[PDB]
C-alpha cells in the first residue's frame, strides 16, 4: 500500500555530496573507478575562495566532492559577500565532519518543486533546520535539514547548469568515461535506533514505509509518492553470533551516517567487468564472491528470469540475485570506499515491474542473507 502522503512535491534524487579533505584526489579516484565524467567545477579558477567542489556525472548520477581551502583566503568575506558557490558550506563544519567521520556523504540532495516551501513545511513538521533557503542567481534555491548524524537532506529547486557559479569542465580534462551507471537507486543510513529515526524523517517528509518481501540489523525503507526516492535506514541487532556490521559502522564512523549508495546500471555485466578490471589499478574492490553452490542454487530461484549463460555471467562477476513477488534484483557490493569500514557502494540492476520501471522493483536483497548462509555450509559440505 502507498498512501502517497508526501508533504511537498518531490521529483528525483539530484546529487550526493562527499565532504573531503582533498576533493581533487577523491574525485579523480572515483572518476576512474566508477566511470564517471568530470562535468563541472567550482574552485579557485572560478573565483571560489572558500571551497573546492568537483562534479562527476554518469547518466543522471551526480557525485559532488568538496573540500575547504585555507580560511585565510576568504577571511575578509562575510556571508553577504561570499565567493562560495554553495552558501551552506562552512569551513568549521566541514573540517569537523571529516575529522569525526573521515570521507563520507554530507548531503543527500533531492530535487523538489519549491525548495523554500519544502524547507518550511519540513521544519513545521519536525525537521531540524541546517541551512535556510537561499536563492542563487535568481535561478536555483537550496535548503538543508538534518537527516541523521551529520548527514543533511538537501532540497534543490530550479526555476527553469548544475548550480550557479559552477563552470562546465574543459573537454580536455573531461574524458568521456562510462561503465554503464545511470542513476542513484537508494541511499541508506545507519543509526543506533531505527524507531526514532524513522519517526523523525517520515514525520517531516510524509514519506511512507515501502513494504518488504538475525543478520545483525533491522531495517525499513522510506519512499516518496512515486517511490523513486528511496531512503532505507538500518539499526544494529546486538548480541548476535557475529558482531553486527551496523555496530562496527557506528563505532568507526563516530555515530550515525550514510552507509551505502546503490547505483543503478543499465548493464550490470558491463559495469562490473569494467570496474573489476580497474580494482587493482586505482578503482574499487568488491566483497568476496559467494561460493559456486550459490550459483548452482540460482537455477531453481531465477531460472525463469536468467539463462544458464546469464547465470554463468553472474558467477564470473560475483553478482548476487534476489527476487520479490514483483521483480528480480541483481546486486553487488564494494569494499569500503575509504580508510574506514563505513561507507561502501552497491551496484544494482532491476528487472520486471514494467508499466517505465516502478521504483524498488525486486526489493533490496534481504533474501540474500538466507541464500548466502545456505550457500556457505553447502559449499563446506563438498
Ligand X SMILES: Cc1c(C(=O)C2=C(O)CCCC2=O)ccc2c1n(CC1CCOCC1)c(=O)n2C
Annotated binding-site positions: 186, 260, 346
- Considering all CA atoms of the chain, what is the largest pairwise distance in Å, rounded to the nearest integer? 70
- Of a second copy, Co ion, ligand X, none, which one sits near residue 287, judging by CB under 5 to 8 A according to partner kind? ligand X
Of 49, 223, 246, 262, the one binding Co ion by CB under 5 A: 262
CA of residue 176 relative to chain centroid, distance: 22
CA torsion 295-296-297-303 (nearest 10°) is: 80
CB 252 within 8 A of CB 100: no
DSSP 130-193: EEEEEEETTTEEEEEEEEETTEEEEEEEE----STT-EE--SSS-----SSEEEEEEEEEE-S-
Give Cβ neighbours of residue 44 (< 8 Å, ≥ 6 apart).
52, 69
Of 287, 303, 326, 379, the one binding ligand X by CB under 6 A: 287
Of 6, 43, 144, 346, the one binding Co ion by CB under 5 A: 346
Which residue lies nearer to ligand X by CB, 225 or 245?
245
Rounded to the nearest 5 degrees, what angle is found at the Cα of 181, between the Cα atoms of 179 and 182? 140
Catalogue the E-assigned strands of 7-139.
10-19, 37-42, 51-58, 61-68, 104-112, 129-136
Which residue lies nearer to Co ion by CB, 262 or 302?
262
Q: How far is the CB of 249 from a second copy (least distance, A)?
A: 12
CB 326 within 8 A of CB 361: yes
Summarize the annotated binding site for Fe cation as residue ranges: 186, 260, 346
Which residue lies nearer to ligand X by CB, 186 or 208?
186
284 interacts with ligand X by CB under 6 A: no
CB 43 within 8 A of CB 54: yes
Of 12, 146, 273, 340, the one binding a second copy by CB under 8 A: 340
CB 264 within 8 A of CB 348: yes
Which residue lies nearer to ligand X by CB, 143 or 198?
198
Instruction: Report 326-345 residues binding ligand X (CB under 6 A).
Output: 333, 344
Instruction: Report 244-263 residues binding ligand X (CB under 6 A).
Output: 245, 262
100 interacts with a second copy by CB under 8 A: yes
- By beta carbon distance, the residue nearest ligand X is 365
In angstroms, rounded to a whole number, what is the distance separating the alpha carbons of residues 301 and 290?
15
In the complex, which residues of this chain contact a second copy (CB under 8 A)?
20-26, 28-33, 38, 43-44, 52, 67, 69-70, 72-73, 95, 98-100, 102-103, 172-175, 177, 251-254, 280-283, 285, 337-341
In the complex, which residues of this chain contact ligand X (CB under 6 A)?
186, 188, 219, 232, 245, 262, 287, 333, 344, 346, 364-366, 368-369, 372
Amino acid at each position: 500500500k502507498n498512501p502517497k502522503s508526501d508533504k511537498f512535491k518531490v521529483k528525483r534524487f539530484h546529487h550526493i555530496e562527499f565532504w573531503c579533505g582533498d576533493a581533487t584526489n577523491v574525485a579523480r579516484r572515483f572518476s576512474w573507478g566508477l566511470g564517471m565524467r568530470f562535468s563541472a567545477k567550482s574552485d579557485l579558477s572560478t573565483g571560489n575562495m572558500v571551497h573546492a567542489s568537483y562534479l562527476l556525472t554518469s547518466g543522471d548520477l551526480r557525485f559532488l566532492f568538496t573540500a575547504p581551502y585555507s580560511p585565510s583566503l576568504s577571511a575578509g568575506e562575510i556571508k553577504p559577500t561570499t565567493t562560495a558557490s554553495i552558501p551552506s558550506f562552512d569551513h568549521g563544519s566541514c573540517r569537523s565532519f571529516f575529522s569525526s567521520h573521515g570521507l563520507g556523504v554530507r548531503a543527500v540532495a533531492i530535487e523538489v518543486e519549491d525548495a523554500e516551501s519544502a524547507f518550511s513545511i519540513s521544519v513545521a513538521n519536525g525537521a531540524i533546520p541546517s541551512s535556510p533557503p537561499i536563492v542563487l542567481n535568481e535561478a536555483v534555491t537550496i535548503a538543508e535539514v538534518k537527516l541523521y548524524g551529520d548527514v543533511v537532506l538537501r532540497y534543490v529547486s530550479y526555476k527553469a547548469e548544475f548550480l550557479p557559479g559552477f563552470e562546465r569542465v574543459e573537454d580536455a580534462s573531461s574524458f568521456p568515461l562510462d561503465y554503464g551507471i545511470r542513476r542513484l537507486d537508494h541511499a541508506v543510513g545507519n543509526v543506533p535506533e531505527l524507531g526514532p529515526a524513522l519517526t523523525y524523517v517520515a514525520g517531516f517528509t510524509g514519506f511512507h514505509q515501502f513494504a518488504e518481501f538475525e543478520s545483525g540489523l533491522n531495517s525499513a525503507v522510506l519512499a516518496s509518492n512515486d517511490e523513486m526516492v528511496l531512503l532505507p535506514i538500518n539499526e544494529p541487532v546486538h548480541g548476535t553470533k557475529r558482531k553486527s556490521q551496523i555496530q562496527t559502522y557506528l563505532e568507526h564512523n563516530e555515530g550515525a551516517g550514510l552507509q551505502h549508495l546503490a547505483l543503478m546500471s543499465e548493464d550490470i555485466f558491463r559495469t562490473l567487468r569494467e570496474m573489476r578490471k580497474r580494482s587493482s589499478i586505482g578503482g574499487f574492490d568488491f566483497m568476496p564472491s559467494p561460493p559456486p553452490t550459490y550459483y548452482q542454487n540460482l537455477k531453481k530461484r531465477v531460472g525463469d528470469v536468467l539463462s544458464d549463460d546469464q547465470i554463468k555471467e553472474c558467477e564470473e562477476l560475483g553478482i548476487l540475485v534476489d527476487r520479490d513477488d514483483q521483480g528480480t534484483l541483481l546486486q553487488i557490493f564494494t569494499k569500503p570506499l575509504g580508510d574506514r569500514p563505513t561507507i561502501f557502494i552497491e551496484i544494482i540492476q532491476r528487472v520486471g515491474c514494467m508499466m517505465y520501471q516502478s521504483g524498488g522493483c525486486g526489493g533490496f536483497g534481504k533474501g540474500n542473507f538466507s541464500l548466502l548462509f545456505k550457500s556457505i555450509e553447502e559449499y563446506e559440505k563438498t
